[PDB]
Amino acid sequence: HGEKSQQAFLRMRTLNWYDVKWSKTSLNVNESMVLSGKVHVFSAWPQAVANPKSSFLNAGEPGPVLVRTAQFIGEQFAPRSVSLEVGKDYAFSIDLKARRAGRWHVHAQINVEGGGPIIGPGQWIEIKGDMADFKDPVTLLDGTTVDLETYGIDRIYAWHFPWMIAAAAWILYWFFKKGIIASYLRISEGKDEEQIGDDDRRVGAIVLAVTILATIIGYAVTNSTFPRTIPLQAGLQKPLTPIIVTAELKGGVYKVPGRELTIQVKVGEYTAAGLRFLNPDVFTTKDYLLADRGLSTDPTPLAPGETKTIEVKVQDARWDIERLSDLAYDTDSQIGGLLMFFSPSGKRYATEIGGPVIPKFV
Amino acid sequence: HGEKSQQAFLRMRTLNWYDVKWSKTSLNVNESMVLSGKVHVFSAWPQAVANPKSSFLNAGEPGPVLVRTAQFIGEQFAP
Amino acid sequence: AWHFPWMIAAAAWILYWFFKKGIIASYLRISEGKDEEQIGDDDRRVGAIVLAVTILATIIGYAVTNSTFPRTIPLQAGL
Amino acid sequence: IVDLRGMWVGVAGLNIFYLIVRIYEQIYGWRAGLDSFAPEFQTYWLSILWTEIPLELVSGLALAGWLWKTRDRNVDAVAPREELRRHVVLVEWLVVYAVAIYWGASFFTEQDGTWHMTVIRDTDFTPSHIIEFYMSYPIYSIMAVGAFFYAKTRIPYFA
Amino acid sequence: IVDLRGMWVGVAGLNIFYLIVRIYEQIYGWRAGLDSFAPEFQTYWLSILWTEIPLELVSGLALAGWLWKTRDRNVDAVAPREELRRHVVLVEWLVVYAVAIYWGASFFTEQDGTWHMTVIRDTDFTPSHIIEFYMSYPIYSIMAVGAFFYAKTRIPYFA
Amino acid sequence: PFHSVAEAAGCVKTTDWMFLTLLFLAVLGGYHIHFMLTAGDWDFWVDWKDRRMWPTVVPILGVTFAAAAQAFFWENFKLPFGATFAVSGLLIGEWINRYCNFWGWTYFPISLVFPSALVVPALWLDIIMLLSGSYVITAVVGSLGWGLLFYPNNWPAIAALHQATEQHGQLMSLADLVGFHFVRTSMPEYIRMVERGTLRTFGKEVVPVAAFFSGFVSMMVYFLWWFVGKWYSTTKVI
Amino acid sequence: PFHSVAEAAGCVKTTDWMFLTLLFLAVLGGYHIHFMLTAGDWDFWVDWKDRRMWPTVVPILGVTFAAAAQAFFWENFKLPFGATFAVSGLLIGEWINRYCNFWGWTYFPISLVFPSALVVPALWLDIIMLLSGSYVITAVVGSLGWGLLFYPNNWPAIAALHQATEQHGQLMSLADLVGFHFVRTSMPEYIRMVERGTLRTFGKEVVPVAAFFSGFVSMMVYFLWWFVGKWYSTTKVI
Ligand SMILES: [Cu+2]
Ligand SMILES: [Cu+2]
Ligand SMILES: [Cu+2]
Ligand SMILES: [Cu+2]
Ligand SMILES: [Cu+2]
């Protein structure tokens, strides 16, 4: 449903996806679900990609099988873009609503119009029933209760068609003044107004006035299929309220191909590719986009007031499967992501990474 | 002398004009007057309008009937 | 050793095609009625060859020079 | 003598082919060919690729041969009844070539516009993307190369 | 009768001149003409400027005069042996004009590209910059104004 | 020649009828395919269906076809069945692709997506054409309204879908929201030109054959330029 | 006329030979000078020798010369010694200037700087030309590979200089680093056009003389346009 085919490099330095869940899992024809996520905006944003100044979160809905009751991002539900910040973090979740049958993965993505569509983790949604039902409603201030997935379509065909009607009104009608051939030689051969001359002309002259007069109608009657109507709302809102350990990576190496990566983070878990690299040294997992027996550490604990030149080993399968050993291509060989460190109790102070990792092949 | 014909929306989100007065009211052929004002620059600036990074304060003088001895804005008189 | 041995297969057309008479001997050798004296067969199949020779003698480079290393990177840059 | 619908095989042999292709792309591409790394793609989908180019080369050349060595040869001097009869045909192809286009212009040309607005693009090898950039155009590109290839060798003027 | 290398003076009188110029620019420009405010520049370098333009005007006009009043005058009606003999010459100049270009196109035209990538540019009066924008082009600009100036007045057609 | 006057008339009114199509269901294509890339889908998503930005594009772009198409047919057949000949093509072209595809494939509300009305203009064109059958005249006037008419024309299909509701302390248009619901993605590629200036062209273009005679009469491109009313047909945006 | 058949043949095979040069060591110039400004030195510094950005420029730009040059020579002399006739010029042109200048003047590693290989393409061009000597055909096919071949061609001279080392916790290509070492500067000016559309032109251009007959046959510019394979010869970048 996307990814993989996204040179790691950037996919791993544009947006850090942690805390991602999903309300339901089996919504039905009309039950709502909520994409759940908190995402970090890397600090050393890839010059390649434009400034995530303006962007947008969304439904990775292969074909809209759910809907869009509303959204949550930064400190607001926004229709147009919003502004993520180089370093800060914003929470988000997005209301949808089963509308169509099927059972497909569903990603949460903050697509950046500034040159990019970055997709964070997603999760299948067993929607059940028959699209045949489903009805996404709402109501114009006027109080009028309307059903969206089927409002006005009637209006269209009822007008955006009755011209494809007055269409033949020329088509056929003008196969009277002899179609081609009977019109062609009917042309070179001396002057040929046989096609034109009067009649013919005044005939259209009419159709014209008919047509136009039969148009002032629409703009008048359709000027009453409401009396008060607005433009289309859009733009941006500078606002966006964020949320509320120190890594360095000085030293790094990884596979080619393999599924391993080492680090020398000097000062829990590890994300980057929206991927999980739990510190099994403390976990009990609660899919393919996450690594259970994730991070491999030196079990020596780091507690308040202290420090260490710690070394971290990233190992698991999904680091190859989901395309990460791709740093072969990707211009800037650097890496990126997070470091989910927790309290002896379990209260995660989280630092990030970002560093030029070096590879070694087969 | 302008305005009105300025879709509110923006006119109401670009610059906040408070504390506005005028030195004289009846200056004569050569007496100086001073436009008086303190203005706020909205926080959620309309993406429509470009960043007020560079701009300029001025005389809405329909035809120059006064002049320009100097200006005051920010912490400076700028040309 | 490579970015030259073509400035080599260079003359391979240069001279070689001064056989089917250089200019003049080719020009009037042209206006004057149809003139395939330059073309016709032979000539053509000759290149047809050189072409296949050249290309086949190119899959080489991309194969052998695909082994003057096995693993190589792009060019690193950015900010 | 002055021919009927040589368009039989034409319109028919097409509208159904093409139509169907729309059905087959309803299934597989939308329940298999929904990811290029997903096998159900490279067997029950990406299959119609090394399946289409092959043909659209032998076909391209197909008319090249047949439609050629099957020319009046001793054309020009020809039955003044035959000319405005060999057009009846010529002006028949450009009619198949006609509709033929419609698909590579008003179908898999704009259908690839609804597809863009579904998947976060895998490769230039998605469904609509496969039956357009690679199918539809080359698909009838031949038609043309024939409906002129025929017309140049089976008709006077075109010499 | 049908001439030899009138190109003697040509190719020779050039390849050495130009060549040398490359030697002289090896020294001074690169050990004097390395800064426009540095005197060793305006004497042992910027010297080849009010030294080149002067010539490239008298020279431009040079051929203008000589090459003119030295035309067949009563041309057109001319020795049918002489024509394809006065070309042997014409088609000789455009050969000097030839190589002539090469310098103002494949030398001090791209040499000024290695120079850009050395000094943090002083003025448009650096070395390569002086023997190109001012030398090389005007340098043979004349050649041309003659190898046609000759050809129009010493040959029929060109009238 | 032709045999009996009942064949000579036959293999005419039939080749003639069967002919008319060749043109349409072929020009149409070459046209839509264009109107697409040109009118960046201001004729696609109701949410892109605005006031300024929109009826300023389709208006213009929606002609170097609807125009030559005219100058074409009307010329050699003084058949004022041209300007409109074009349109329909696009409408019946898109309108088709609009259904089944968007609708029956990743089902899209026939509401969010649906082409813009043109049939009208075409007429006030093919007509200011019929009467007064000269270029310039049909250009200035004709082109003029051809754009003014645009929006006013589309009011019906458009108007209603602009009423507004208050979604979470904010304002939007039935339209807007329809765009909020049922989601999609980006643009999102490009190269889209080999297949064009290649074979599909000079492997269909050559006709010609070595000798002139052509549909290069599209010196209607002109027709378009004088559009500067469509850029007028804009300031019908307060 | 010509005197004895041993002069009449002489002052021919000699003016003819001496002639061939005039063209080459003159067209070359007018060509390189161009290929320079056009191919912004993606044919200069190995560090600019990449994948996308590069074999997308030289490819195209590297033709409205290698092309007309062809259509030129092959035309009036059905001498398929054209497309390649061009190239060499550039190569022997730059390759020259590359040495002595960059090298013997502010010495530059013959490594950091060194032109791109073209000889190959030229052939797969001057040939898909020879056989099948028609325009369009030589355009579509020919132009096509003319670009695909590009990179693959240059693999040799390029490939090796891309191995990588770890300079201070970071990664770079032999290439990259060669660019780090031995330094230079900027672009860094411009006006560069008087000398061009002046005298060097209509003071050499006029030829003509009042009457036509010309090398305006460069209606090969076309040749170039159909390049849309070179823009294809791009997506040979993963
Ligand atoms: Cu997925
Ligand atoms: Cu997904
Ligand atoms: Cu006022
Ligand atoms: Cu596409
Ligand atoms: Cu310079």
PDB file of N, CA, C and O and ligand atoms in Angstrom, chain D residues 112-113 116 121 126 129 132, chain F residues 187-189 192, ligand 4:
ATOM      1  N   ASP D 112      -5.864   6.209 -15.216  1.00  0.00           N
ATOM      2  CA  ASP D 112      -4.602   6.268 -14.498  1.00  0.00           C
ATOM      3  C   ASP D 112      -4.580   7.515 -13.626  1.00  0.00           C
ATOM      4  O   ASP D 112      -3.605   7.774 -12.923  1.00  0.00           O
ATOM      5  N   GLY D 113      -5.669   8.279 -13.679  1.00  0.00           N
ATOM      6  CA  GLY D 113      -5.782   9.501 -12.900  1.00  0.00           C
ATOM      7  C   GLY D 113      -6.575   9.270 -11.630  1.00  0.00           C
ATOM      8  O   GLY D 113      -6.543  10.084 -10.703  1.00  0.00           O
ATOM      9  N   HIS D 116      -3.872   7.179  -9.535  1.00  0.00           N
ATOM     10  CA  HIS D 116      -2.905   8.043  -8.848  1.00  0.00           C
ATOM     11  C   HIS D 116      -3.484   8.358  -7.482  1.00  0.00           C
ATOM     12  O   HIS D 116      -2.787   8.327  -6.463  1.00  0.00           O
ATOM     13  N   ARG D 121       1.521   5.369  -5.016  1.00  0.00           N
ATOM     14  CA  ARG D 121       2.353   4.869  -6.105  1.00  0.00           C
ATOM     15  C   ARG D 121       3.468   3.895  -5.710  1.00  0.00           C
ATOM     16  O   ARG D 121       4.328   4.207  -4.871  1.00  0.00           O
ATOM     17  N   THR D 126       1.968   0.059 -11.977  1.00  0.00           N
ATOM     18  CA  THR D 126       0.712  -0.217 -11.298  1.00  0.00           C
ATOM     19  C   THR D 126      -0.241  -0.630 -12.418  1.00  0.00           C
ATOM     20  O   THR D 126       0.159  -0.683 -13.581  1.00  0.00           O
ATOM     21  N   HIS D 129      -1.471   2.198 -14.934  1.00  0.00           N
ATOM     22  CA  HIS D 129      -0.135   2.575 -15.399  1.00  0.00           C
ATOM     23  C   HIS D 129       0.491   1.535 -16.338  1.00  0.00           C
ATOM     24  O   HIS D 129       1.357   1.866 -17.155  1.00  0.00           O
ATOM     25  N   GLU D 132      -1.604   1.504 -19.859  1.00  0.00           N
ATOM     26  CA  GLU D 132      -1.591   2.775 -20.571  1.00  0.00           C
ATOM     27  C   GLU D 132      -0.220   2.955 -21.184  1.00  0.00           C
ATOM     28  O   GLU D 132       0.018   2.595 -22.338  1.00  0.00           O
TER      29      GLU D 132
ATOM     30  N   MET F 187       0.032  13.645  -6.997  1.00  0.00           N
ATOM     31  CA  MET F 187       0.029  13.922  -8.455  1.00  0.00           C
ATOM     32  C   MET F 187       0.184  12.715  -9.419  1.00  0.00           C
ATOM     33  O   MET F 187      -0.677  12.514 -10.304  1.00  0.00           O
ATOM     34  N   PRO F 188       1.290  11.928  -9.300  1.00  0.00           N
ATOM     35  CA  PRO F 188       2.463  11.988  -8.402  1.00  0.00           C
ATOM     36  C   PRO F 188       3.837  11.641  -9.063  1.00  0.00           C
ATOM     37  O   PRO F 188       4.824  11.428  -8.339  1.00  0.00           O
ATOM     38  N   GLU F 189       3.898  11.598 -10.406  1.00  0.00           N
ATOM     39  CA  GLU F 189       5.124  11.224 -11.160  1.00  0.00           C
ATOM     40  C   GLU F 189       5.626  12.204 -12.242  1.00  0.00           C
ATOM     41  O   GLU F 189       5.959  13.371 -11.972  1.00  0.00           O
ATOM     42  N   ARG F 192       5.922  11.249 -18.815  1.00  0.00           N
ATOM     43  CA  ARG F 192       4.795  11.344 -19.713  1.00  0.00           C
ATOM     44  C   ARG F 192       5.016  12.138 -20.998  1.00  0.00           C
ATOM     45  O   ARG F 192       4.358  13.154 -21.200  1.00  0.00           O
TER      46      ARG F 192
HETATM   47 CU    CU H   4       0.333   7.478 -13.744  1.00  0.00          CU
END
